């Protein structure tokens, strides 16, 4: 039906059919619901004669929001199923409730993303929900940084054992190449999220996030001692596209208040 409509330049009618189908309780897989929404989004973004711009935009917007949530749900499901630390018994249960109609952001957060400590996805969820809560957002940033640091540390350790002759714990895939220093893997995590949310989000309050990253750098010796650029935190946020004025503005505040580790010498 949709194919018929489109060839007749009736894109809006196709977007309507596809969207409703994606919201329906028919037996449709999550990935198919992602395709349906993605098509509707495209079809509603172009003019269809006889239909008001307002009506087009409202549909294009509903498809865009549902598509964002759908992608989150798909990222979850995939990660959970592949997670070595999740019991098989549970995985089958997760696949049943996530590989179907699109769920609310509350559920995705509480029942899955928060339970499995997938903090990066938690952040994407706070973005999609326009979640106004600076403290929780920062708590999640702090957990993500620390989790990533510990994982990078672990991987560098395993490597050091290979290069010394030792044996890795049973069922640990060796690293045939020097993995990245912790500050490199952490900043990788920050970039992946930034590109996904576009810095204009409330999960990038530079006034809170930049001091925390700088704090991390100091309190974990991610500096010259290990061969890192001592300004790496600043480089990171500049390339990311934070305006220069705002940077200096925050750094000033850091210097005046002399908080947490930014003290003495």
């Amino acid at each position: 039906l949709c194919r018929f409509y489109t060839t007749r330049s009736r894109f809006f009618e196709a977007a309507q059919v596809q969207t409703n189908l994606a919201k329906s309780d028919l037996n449709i897989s999550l990935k198919d619901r992602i395709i349906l929404l993605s098509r509707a989004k495209g079809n509603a973004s172009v003019n269809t004669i006889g239909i008001s711009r307002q009506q087009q935009q409202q549909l294009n917007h509903e498809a865009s929001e549902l598509l964002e949530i759908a992608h989150i749900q798909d990222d979850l499901l995939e990660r959970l199923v592949a997670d070595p630390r999740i019991p098989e018994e549970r995985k089958a249960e997760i696949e049943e409730f996530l590989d179907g109609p699109i769920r609310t952001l509350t559920d995705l957060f509480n029942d899955y993303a928060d339970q499995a400590n997938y903090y990066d996805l938690c952040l994407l969820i706070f973005h999609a929900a326009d979640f106004h809560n600076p403290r929780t957002i920062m708590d999640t940033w702090n957990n993500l940084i620390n989790q990533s640091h510990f994982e990078a540390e672990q991987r560098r350790e395993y490597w050091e054992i290979v290069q010394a002759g030792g044996d890795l714990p049973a069922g640990v895939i060796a690293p045939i190449a020097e993995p990245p220093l912790p500050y490199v893997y952490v900043s990788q995590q920050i970039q992946l999220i930034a590109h996904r949310t576009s810095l204009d989000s409330l999960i990038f309050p530079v006034n809170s996030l930049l001091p925390v990253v700088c704090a991390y750098a100091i309190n974990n010796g991610q500096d010259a001692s290990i061969g890192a650029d001592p300004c790496w935190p600043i480089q990171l946020f500049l390339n990311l596209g934070v305006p220069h004025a705002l940077m200096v503005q925050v750094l000033e505040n850091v210097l005046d208040t002399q908080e947490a580790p930014f003290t003495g010498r």
């Binding site: 999740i86 098989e88 995985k91 249960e93 997760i94 409730f97 699109i102 609310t104 995705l108 339970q115």
Partner: protein, 757 residues
Amino acid sequence: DLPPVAKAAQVVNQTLQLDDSYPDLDSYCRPGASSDYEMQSSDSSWAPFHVVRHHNIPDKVFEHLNAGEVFTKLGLFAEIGYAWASIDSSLFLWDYTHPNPELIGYEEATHTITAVALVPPKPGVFVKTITHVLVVATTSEIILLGVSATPTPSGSKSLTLYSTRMSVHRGGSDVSFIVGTKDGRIFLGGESDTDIHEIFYQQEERWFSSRCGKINHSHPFGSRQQEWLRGLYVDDTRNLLYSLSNRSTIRTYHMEGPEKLTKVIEKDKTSCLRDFAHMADSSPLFTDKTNIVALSPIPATEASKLHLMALTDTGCRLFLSATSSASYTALAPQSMQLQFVKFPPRESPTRIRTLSQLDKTSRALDPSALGFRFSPGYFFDVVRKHPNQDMLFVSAPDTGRIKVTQPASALKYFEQGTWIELENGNRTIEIGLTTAPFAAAKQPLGFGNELAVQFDQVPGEFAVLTNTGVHIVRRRRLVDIFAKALGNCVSASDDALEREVRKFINQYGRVETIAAALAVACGQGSDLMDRNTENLARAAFIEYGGQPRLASVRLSSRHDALALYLTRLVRTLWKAKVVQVDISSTIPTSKLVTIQENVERLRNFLEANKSTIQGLAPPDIANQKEHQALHALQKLMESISEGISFVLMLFDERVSDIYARLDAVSQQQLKDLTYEQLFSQTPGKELAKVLVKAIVNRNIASGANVETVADALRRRCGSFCSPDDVVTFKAQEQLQRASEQAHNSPVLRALLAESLR
């Protein structure tokens, strides 16, 4: 001699006793056997259960599950709406009612997880906000975690985890089964042997004792043959613990103390088979080749003699009694005997609708892989005839037929059954109750009366966990079936309704059927076309309600239906004390509101049909007493609503303050005041008139507003308040407020002069 409300209260008291005389399980599962079923298609309006929704497993859990190196496992926490999945040494919980849940991950464990359970906490150990304990068993240790499952605005518990430093090394025995008692005792068993262990834990650390310990209650020694456990089962009402072995041996343990566990019965399959052979009806469905796949304890509240149900792989439900050697020293039983067998139904599931001896040979439930029983007898059986698709047989007691059966010697285990199909690939793992445990009474007689509690507790719902998701199955009440059936009669003849109604009368009797019509007419079942269904229900209540007749008179079935419905709306109130002395209310305020709304909607229904319903309008001796009886019930209804409004008014104030400034006789009268007395006995009315006369006195001391509390008492609880008392209250208002303003000179001469007026 006897006024209306007192006459109607007599009908209520006798109706309460009639509902509480519903046969106990022992009475219709007497020694012998049964194959009584009425099967219903799952898509039929008469289906006893039906699927209401499904919840897929989150995709992230599928990612972890398919990332499993050695071992995975799924399970249910149906009490709080959570499921869990273990992958090797990692555990993930999530709220399955949430549309996009976040995964609560716990990966501290070092070795493979083999069992997980959610149990109550030991009292006086943890902060009150800790609602549960999470037990995590690995191949190396058992770990206790504190849990707080506080409800959220959405209706799904918020789960947060607490560390405890409580753990013990496992030992050599596998742990695959964990169960908890009401008091927080934790018992363990597994697939290494038949031993039962218990985990102890305490708040204080001692130099001679750790915070957490483990002991083997079985004390094994010497020669031991291979045998291990298939499950553990608790019955708190009897302080018993049951184990089922791989050889189908049933062991019973008694908790003679807070730290003791004593084996008191051991009954192997041979003993069960010997009992079975002594029964009148032996069957090839139960032999030495047959396996017992599941047990289900039966609590003492439900039945005195029958302690346990055992399910065979052929689908036979074995009901076992247990008895103590003596009557005094909890008392531990010492014998267990197979007494009664419910054999499988014969009808198999079909895509197309297909068209009196004991049936003891049916293979319809062969093979039964998993089985569950919930009070008052809801039975779920996972039949695995094919290795890819499970079929779910679900049955309930035929409460309507059991209640009407007469005499008692004709009682049999009648059941309503249905087949629920799960899609290809769905392997059922576990089934758990999501709502509060069912109980219509506090003792076996009356316990199983589903009809009595249709409007006091939501229908039972059950979470069916599969490898693909969680399916919600809901028990359907008579009013649900009646409303659905009538919904199909909307487009049919006058005789189409009469035909459907006659089905209900032949099963439930006329009174129960007309009571269901009255309930549907009043909007019951609508929490689930609806105007036409309610109008059809009204038409059924009028047309088929019968009439009064000389035998002393026999009132119509329409009257008994109104009395039955009204009684069941207030059964939780009638005999209960109004207050609990720091005085508080016995019944939560939210419950009093819903009861009042139900009573008022019933009253509204009678008023809107005063002209069309026989007996309401005034009318020879038969119709006379019919009019008097119906009038008395309606006077009790308004009295019930006034009484409830009075109790709500009372606790909106500061009752403890009012209770303090009160005489002893009136404190004692209020101490043992029941709702029945408040509704239907002069002393409740006289005491009510005292309390109102006292609350206003106090209200004036607070002095927020007199004329608002006035109009509050004036209208709603009129006929119990007096207009000469509010004007008096208005006078005592200015008098006390003249004593409040006493220091002022010119303000009193207006207060005292108006008080005098």
